[PDB]
CSV table of N, CA, C and O and ligand atoms in Angstrom, one decimal:
chain,number,residue,atom,x,y,z
A,1,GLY,N,9.5,-22.1,31.3
A,1,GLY,CA,10.1,-23.4,31.5
A,1,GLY,C,9.5,-24.5,30.6
A,1,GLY,O,8.4,-24.4,30.3
A,2,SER,N,10.3,-25.5,30.2
A,2,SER,CA,9.9,-26.5,29.3
A,2,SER,C,9.4,-27.8,30.1
A,2,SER,O,8.6,-28.5,29.7
A,3,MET,N,10.1,-28.0,31.3
A,3,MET,CA,9.8,-29.1,32.1
A,3,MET,C,8.7,-28.8,33.1
A,3,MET,O,8.7,-27.7,33.7
A,4,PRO,N,7.7,-29.7,33.3
A,4,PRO,CA,6.7,-29.6,34.3
A,4,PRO,C,7.3,-29.3,35.7
A,4,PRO,O,7.9,-30.2,36.3
A,5,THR,N,7.3,-28.1,36.1
A,5,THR,CA,8.0,-27.6,37.3
A,5,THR,C,7.2,-28.0,38.6
A,5,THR,O,6.0,-27.7,38.7
A,6,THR,N,7.9,-28.7,39.4
A,6,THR,CA,7.4,-29.1,40.7
A,6,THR,C,8.1,-28.2,41.8
A,6,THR,O,9.4,-28.3,41.9
A,7,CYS,N,7.4,-27.5,42.6
A,7,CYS,CA,8.0,-26.7,43.6
A,7,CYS,C,8.4,-27.6,44.8
A,7,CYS,O,8.0,-28.7,45.0
A,8,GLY,N,9.3,-27.0,45.6
A,8,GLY,CA,10.0,-27.8,46.6
A,8,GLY,C,9.4,-27.7,47.9
A,8,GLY,O,10.1,-28.0,48.9
A,9,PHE,N,8.2,-27.4,48.0
A,9,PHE,CA,7.5,-27.3,49.3
A,9,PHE,C,7.1,-28.8,49.7
A,9,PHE,O,6.8,-29.6,48.9
A,10,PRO,N,7.3,-29.0,51.0
A,10,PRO,CA,6.9,-30.3,51.6
A,10,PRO,C,5.5,-30.7,51.3
A,10,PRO,O,5.2,-31.9,51.2
A,11,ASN,N,4.7,-29.7,51.2
A,11,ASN,CA,3.3,-29.9,50.8
A,11,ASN,C,2.8,-28.7,50.1
A,11,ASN,O,2.3,-27.7,50.7
A,12,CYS,N,2.9,-28.7,48.7
A,12,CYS,CA,2.3,-27.6,48.0
A,12,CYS,C,0.8,-27.7,47.9
A,12,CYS,O,0.3,-28.5,47.1
A,13,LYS,N,0.1,-27.0,48.7
A,13,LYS,CA,-1.3,-27.0,48.8
A,13,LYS,C,-1.9,-26.0,47.8
A,13,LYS,O,-3.1,-25.8,47.8
A,14,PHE,N,-1.1,-25.4,47.0
A,14,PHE,CA,-1.5,-24.4,46.1
A,14,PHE,C,-1.7,-24.9,44.7
A,14,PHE,O,-2.7,-24.6,44.0
A,15,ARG,N,-0.8,-25.7,44.2
A,15,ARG,CA,-1.0,-26.4,42.9
A,15,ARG,C,-2.0,-27.5,43.0
A,15,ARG,O,-2.5,-28.0,42.0
A,16,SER,N,-2.3,-27.9,44.2
A,16,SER,CA,-3.3,-28.9,44.5
A,16,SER,C,-4.6,-28.2,44.8
A,16,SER,O,-5.7,-28.8,44.7
A,17,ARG,N,-4.5,-26.9,45.1
A,17,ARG,CA,-5.7,-26.1,45.3
A,17,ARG,C,-6.4,-25.9,44.0
A,17,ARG,O,-7.6,-25.6,44.0
A,18,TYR,N,-5.7,-26.0,42.9
A,18,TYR,CA,-6.2,-25.8,41.6
A,18,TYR,C,-6.6,-27.2,41.0
A,18,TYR,O,-6.1,-28.2,41.5
A,19,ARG,N,-7.4,-27.2,40.0
A,19,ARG,CA,-8.0,-28.4,39.5
A,19,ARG,C,-7.7,-28.5,38.0
A,19,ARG,O,-8.6,-28.2,37.2
A,20,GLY,N,-6.5,-28.9,37.6
A,20,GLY,CA,-6.2,-29.1,36.2
A,20,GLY,C,-5.4,-27.9,35.6
A,20,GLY,O,-4.8,-28.0,34.6
A,21,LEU,N,-5.5,-26.8,36.3
A,21,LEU,CA,-4.9,-25.6,35.8
A,21,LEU,C,-4.2,-24.9,37.0
A,21,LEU,O,-4.8,-24.2,37.8
A,22,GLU,N,-2.8,-25.0,37.0
A,22,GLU,CA,-2.0,-24.5,38.1
A,22,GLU,C,-1.7,-23.0,37.8
A,22,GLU,O,-0.7,-22.5,38.4
A,23,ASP,N,-2.4,-22.4,36.9
A,23,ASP,CA,-2.2,-21.0,36.5
A,23,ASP,C,-0.9,-20.8,35.7
A,23,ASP,O,-0.7,-19.7,35.2
A,24,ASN,N,-0.1,-21.9,35.7
A,24,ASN,CA,1.2,-21.8,35.1
A,24,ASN,C,2.0,-20.6,35.8
A,24,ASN,O,2.7,-19.8,35.1
A,25,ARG,N,1.8,-20.5,37.1
A,25,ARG,CA,2.4,-19.5,37.9
A,25,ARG,C,3.9,-19.4,37.7
A,25,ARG,O,4.6,-20.4,37.4
A,26,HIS,N,4.4,-18.2,37.9
A,26,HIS,CA,5.8,-17.9,37.8
A,26,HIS,C,6.6,-18.7,38.8
A,26,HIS,O,6.5,-18.4,40.0
A,27,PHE,N,7.3,-19.7,38.4
A,27,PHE,CA,8.1,-20.6,39.3
A,27,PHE,C,9.4,-19.9,39.7
A,27,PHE,O,10.3,-19.7,38.9
A,28,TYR,N,9.4,-19.4,40.9
A,28,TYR,CA,10.6,-18.7,41.4
A,28,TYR,C,11.7,-19.6,41.8
A,28,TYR,O,11.6,-20.6,42.4
A,29,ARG,N,12.9,-19.1,41.4
A,29,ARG,CA,14.1,-19.8,41.9
A,29,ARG,C,14.5,-19.1,43.1
A,29,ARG,O,14.3,-17.9,43.3
A,30,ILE,N,15.1,-19.8,44.1
A,30,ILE,CA,15.6,-19.3,45.3
A,30,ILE,C,16.6,-18.2,45.1
A,30,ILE,O,17.7,-18.4,44.5
A,31,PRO,N,16.3,-17.0,45.5
A,31,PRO,CA,17.2,-15.8,45.4
A,31,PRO,C,18.6,-16.1,46.1
A,31,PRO,O,18.7,-16.9,47.0
A,32,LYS,N,19.6,-15.4,45.6
A,32,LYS,CA,20.9,-15.5,46.2
A,32,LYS,C,21.4,-14.2,46.8
A,32,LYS,O,22.5,-14.0,47.2
A,33,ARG,N,20.5,-13.2,46.7
A,33,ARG,CA,20.8,-11.9,47.1
A,33,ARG,C,19.5,-11.2,47.7
A,33,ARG,O,18.5,-11.1,47.0
A,34,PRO,N,19.5,-10.8,49.0
A,34,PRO,CA,20.7,-11.0,49.8
A,34,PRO,C,20.8,-12.4,50.3
A,34,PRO,O,19.9,-13.2,50.2
A,35,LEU,N,22.0,-12.7,50.9
A,35,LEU,CA,22.2,-14.1,51.3
A,35,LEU,C,21.3,-14.5,52.5
A,35,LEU,O,20.8,-15.7,52.5
A,36,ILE,N,21.0,-13.6,53.3
A,36,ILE,CA,20.1,-13.8,54.5
A,36,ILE,C,18.7,-14.1,54.0
A,36,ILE,O,17.9,-14.8,54.6
A,37,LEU,N,18.3,-13.6,52.8
A,37,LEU,CA,17.0,-13.8,52.2
A,37,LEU,C,17.0,-15.2,51.7
A,37,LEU,O,16.0,-16.0,51.9
A,38,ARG,N,18.1,-15.6,51.0
A,38,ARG,CA,18.2,-17.0,50.6
A,38,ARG,C,18.2,-18.0,51.7
A,38,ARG,O,17.5,-19.0,51.6
A,39,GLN,N,18.8,-17.6,52.8
A,39,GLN,CA,18.8,-18.5,54.0
A,39,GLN,C,17.4,-18.6,54.6
A,39,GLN,O,16.9,-19.7,54.9
A,40,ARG,N,16.6,-17.5,54.6
A,40,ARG,CA,15.3,-17.4,55.1
A,40,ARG,C,14.3,-18.2,54.2
A,40,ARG,O,13.4,-18.9,54.7
A,41,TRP,N,14.6,-18.3,52.9
A,41,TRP,CA,13.8,-19.0,51.9
A,41,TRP,C,13.8,-20.5,52.2
A,41,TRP,O,12.8,-21.2,51.9
A,42,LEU,N,14.9,-21.0,52.8
A,42,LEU,CA,14.9,-22.4,53.2
A,42,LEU,C,14.1,-22.7,54.4
A,42,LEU,O,13.7,-23.9,54.6
A,43,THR,N,13.8,-21.7,55.2
A,43,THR,CA,12.9,-21.9,56.4
A,43,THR,C,11.5,-22.3,56.0
A,43,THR,O,10.9,-23.2,56.6
A,44,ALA,N,11.0,-21.7,54.9
A,44,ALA,CA,9.6,-21.9,54.5
A,44,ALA,C,9.4,-23.4,54.1
A,44,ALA,O,8.3,-24.0,54.2
A,45,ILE,N,10.5,-24.0,53.5
A,45,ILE,CA,10.4,-25.3,53.0
A,45,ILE,C,10.9,-26.3,54.0
A,45,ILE,O,10.9,-27.5,53.7
A,46,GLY,N,11.5,-25.8,55.1
A,46,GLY,CA,12.1,-26.7,56.1
A,46,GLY,C,13.3,-27.5,55.5
A,46,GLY,O,13.5,-28.6,55.9
A,47,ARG,N,14.0,-26.9,54.6
A,47,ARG,CA,15.1,-27.6,53.9
A,47,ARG,C,16.4,-26.9,54.2
A,47,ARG,O,16.4,-25.8,54.7
A,48,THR,N,17.5,-27.6,53.8
A,48,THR,CA,18.8,-27.0,54.0
A,48,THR,C,19.4,-26.6,52.7
A,48,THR,O,18.8,-26.9,51.6
A,49,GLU,N,20.6,-26.0,52.7
A,49,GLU,CA,21.1,-25.4,51.5
A,49,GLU,C,21.7,-26.4,50.5
A,49,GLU,O,21.7,-26.2,49.3
A,50,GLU,N,22.1,-27.5,51.0
A,50,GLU,CA,22.6,-28.6,50.2
A,50,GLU,C,21.4,-29.4,49.7
A,50,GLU,O,21.6,-30.3,48.9
A,51,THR,N,20.3,-29.1,50.1
A,51,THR,CA,19.0,-29.8,49.8
A,51,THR,C,18.0,-28.9,49.1
A,51,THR,O,16.8,-29.1,49.1
A,52,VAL,N,18.6,-27.8,48.5
A,52,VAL,CA,17.8,-26.8,47.9
A,52,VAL,C,18.5,-26.1,46.7
A,52,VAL,O,19.7,-26.5,46.5
A,53,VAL,N,17.8,-25.3,46.0
A,53,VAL,CA,18.3,-24.5,44.9
A,53,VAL,C,18.5,-25.2,43.6
A,53,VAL,O,18.1,-24.7,42.5
A,54,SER,N,19.0,-26.4,43.6
A,54,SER,CA,19.2,-27.2,42.4
A,54,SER,C,17.9,-27.4,41.6
A,54,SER,O,17.7,-26.8,40.6
A,55,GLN,N,17.0,-28.3,42.1
A,55,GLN,CA,15.8,-28.6,41.5
A,55,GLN,C,14.7,-27.7,42.1
A,55,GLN,O,13.7,-27.3,41.4
A,56,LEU,N,14.8,-27.5,43.4
A,56,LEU,CA,13.7,-26.9,44.2
A,56,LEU,C,13.4,-25.5,43.6
A,56,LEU,O,14.2,-24.7,43.3
A,57,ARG,N,12.1,-25.3,43.4
A,57,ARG,CA,11.5,-24.1,43.0
A,57,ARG,C,10.3,-23.7,43.9
A,57,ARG,O,9.9,-24.5,44.7
A,58,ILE,N,9.8,-22.5,43.7
A,58,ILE,CA,8.7,-22.0,44.6
A,58,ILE,C,7.7,-21.3,43.7
A,58,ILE,O,7.9,-20.4,43.0
A,59,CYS,N,6.4,-21.8,43.8
A,59,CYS,CA,5.3,-21.2,43.2
A,59,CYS,C,5.1,-19.7,43.7
A,59,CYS,O,5.4,-19.4,44.8
A,60,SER,N,4.7,-18.9,42.8
A,60,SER,CA,4.4,-17.5,43.1
A,60,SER,C,3.2,-17.4,44.0
A,60,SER,O,2.9,-16.3,44.6
A,61,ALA,N,2.5,-18.5,44.1
A,61,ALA,CA,1.3,-18.6,44.9
A,61,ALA,C,1.6,-18.7,46.4
A,61,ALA,O,0.7,-18.6,47.2
A,62,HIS,N,2.9,-18.9,46.7
A,62,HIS,CA,3.3,-19.0,48.1
A,62,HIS,C,3.7,-17.6,48.6
A,62,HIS,O,4.4,-17.5,49.6
A,63,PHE,N,3.2,-16.5,48.0
A,63,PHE,CA,3.5,-15.2,48.4
A,63,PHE,C,2.2,-14.4,48.4
A,63,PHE,O,1.4,-14.4,47.5
A,64,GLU,N,2.1,-13.6,49.5
A,64,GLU,CA,1.0,-12.6,49.6
A,64,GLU,C,1.2,-11.5,48.6
A,64,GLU,O,1.9,-10.5,49.0
A,65,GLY,N,0.7,-11.6,47.4
A,65,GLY,CA,1.0,-10.7,46.4
A,65,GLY,C,1.6,-11.3,45.2
A,65,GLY,O,1.6,-10.7,44.1
A,66,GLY,N,2.1,-12.5,45.4
A,66,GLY,CA,2.7,-13.3,44.3
A,66,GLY,C,4.0,-12.7,43.7
A,66,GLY,O,4.4,-12.9,42.6
A,67,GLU,N,4.6,-11.9,44.6
A,67,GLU,CA,5.8,-11.1,44.1
A,67,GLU,C,7.0,-11.4,45.0
A,67,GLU,O,7.0,-11.2,46.2
A,68,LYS,N,8.1,-11.9,44.3
A,68,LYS,CA,9.4,-12.1,45.0
A,68,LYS,C,10.3,-10.9,44.5
A,68,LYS,O,10.6,-10.7,43.4
A,69,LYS,N,10.8,-10.2,45.5
A,69,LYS,CA,11.7,-9.1,45.2
A,69,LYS,C,13.0,-9.4,45.9
A,69,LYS,O,13.9,-10.2,45.3
A,70,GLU,N,13.3,-8.9,47.1
A,70,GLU,CA,14.5,-9.2,47.8
A,70,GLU,C,14.3,-9.2,49.3
A,70,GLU,O,15.2,-9.1,50.1
A,71,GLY,N,13.0,-9.3,49.7
A,71,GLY,CA,12.7,-9.4,51.1
A,71,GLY,C,11.4,-10.2,51.3
A,71,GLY,O,10.7,-10.0,52.3
A,72,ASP,N,11.2,-11.1,50.4
A,72,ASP,CA,9.9,-11.9,50.4
A,72,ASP,C,10.2,-13.3,50.5
A,72,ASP,O,10.8,-13.9,49.5
A,73,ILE,N,9.9,-14.0,51.6
A,73,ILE,CA,10.1,-15.4,51.7
A,73,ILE,C,8.7,-16.1,51.5
A,73,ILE,O,7.7,-15.6,51.8
A,74,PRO,N,8.8,-17.3,50.8
A,74,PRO,CA,7.5,-18.1,50.5
A,74,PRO,C,6.8,-18.5,51.8
A,74,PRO,O,7.5,-18.7,52.8
A,75,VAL,N,5.5,-18.7,51.8
A,75,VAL,CA,4.8,-19.3,52.9
A,75,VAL,C,3.9,-20.4,52.4
A,75,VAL,O,3.6,-20.5,51.3
A,76,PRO,N,3.5,-21.3,53.4
A,76,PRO,CA,2.7,-22.5,53.0
A,76,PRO,C,1.3,-22.0,52.6
A,76,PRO,O,0.7,-22.6,51.7
A,77,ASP,N,0.8,-21.0,53.2
A,77,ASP,CA,-0.5,-20.5,52.9
A,77,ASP,C,-0.6,-19.0,53.4
A,77,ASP,O,-0.8,-18.8,54.6
A,78,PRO,N,-0.5,-18.0,52.5
A,78,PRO,CA,-0.5,-16.6,52.9
A,78,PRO,C,-1.9,-16.2,53.5
A,78,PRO,O,-2.0,-15.2,54.2
A,79,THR,N,-2.9,-17.1,53.2
A,79,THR,CA,-4.2,-16.8,53.7
A,79,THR,C,-4.4,-17.4,55.1
A,79,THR,O,-5.5,-17.2,55.7
A,80,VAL,N,-3.4,-18.1,55.6
A,80,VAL,CA,-3.5,-18.8,56.9
A,80,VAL,C,-2.3,-18.5,57.8
A,80,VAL,O,-2.4,-18.1,58.9
A,81,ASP,N,-1.1,-18.8,57.2
A,81,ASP,CA,0.1,-18.6,57.9
A,81,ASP,C,0.6,-17.2,58.0
A,81,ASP,O,-0.1,-16.3,57.5
A,82,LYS,N,1.8,-17.0,58.5
A,82,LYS,CA,2.4,-15.7,58.6
A,82,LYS,C,3.4,-15.5,57.5
A,82,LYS,O,4.6,-15.9,57.6
A,83,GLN,N,3.0,-14.8,56.4
A,83,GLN,CA,3.8,-14.3,55.3
A,83,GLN,C,5.2,-13.8,55.9
A,83,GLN,O,5.3,-12.8,56.5
A,84,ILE,N,6.2,-14.6,55.6
A,84,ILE,CA,7.6,-14.3,56.1
A,84,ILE,C,8.2,-13.3,55.2
A,84,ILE,O,8.5,-13.6,54.0
A,85,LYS,N,8.4,-12.1,55.6
A,85,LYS,CA,9.0,-11.0,54.9
A,85,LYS,C,10.1,-10.4,55.7
A,85,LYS,O,10.1,-10.4,56.9
A,86,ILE,N,11.1,-9.8,55.1
A,86,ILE,CA,12.2,-9.2,55.8
A,86,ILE,C,12.5,-7.8,55.3
A,86,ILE,O,12.1,-7.4,54.2
A,87,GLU,N,13.0,-7.0,56.2
A,87,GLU,CA,13.4,-5.6,55.8
A,87,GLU,C,14.9,-5.6,55.4
A,87,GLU,O,15.8,-5.6,56.3
A,88,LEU,N,15.1,-5.6,54.1
A,88,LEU,CA,16.5,-5.6,53.6
A,88,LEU,C,17.1,-4.3,53.8
A,88,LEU,O,16.5,-3.2,53.6
A,89,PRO,N,18.4,-4.3,54.4
A,89,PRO,CA,19.1,-3.1,54.6
A,89,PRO,C,19.3,-2.3,53.3
A,89,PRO,O,19.8,-2.8,52.3
A,90,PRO,N,18.8,-1.0,53.3
A,90,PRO,CA,18.9,-0.2,52.1
A,90,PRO,C,20.3,0.1,51.6
A,90,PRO,O,21.0,1.0,52.1
A,91,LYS,N,20.8,-0.7,50.7
A,91,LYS,CA,22.2,-0.6,50.1
A,91,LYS,C,23.2,-1.1,51.1
A,91,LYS,O,24.3,-1.5,50.6
B,101,ZN,ZN1,4.1,-24.7,45.4
């Protein structure tokens, strides 16, 4: 990305956890597949669908493992909170 990316968390304690170097972490866009995963992604940020996706992005630091696939929802703190993940129906 060319623009200084700000994630859409109500309180990103991760880019603030760093001091001058946010690791330039992979800024994830909210998945659209599956749809229920996209829906779940809004839960982490406490946002709605008309209030998300456009500008809102998510730091890879909001994941236990830093990996977004198709069943991984962001969390406020993987080291404290409950990493929200889902079991996507196989095919
Ligand atoms: Zn963040």
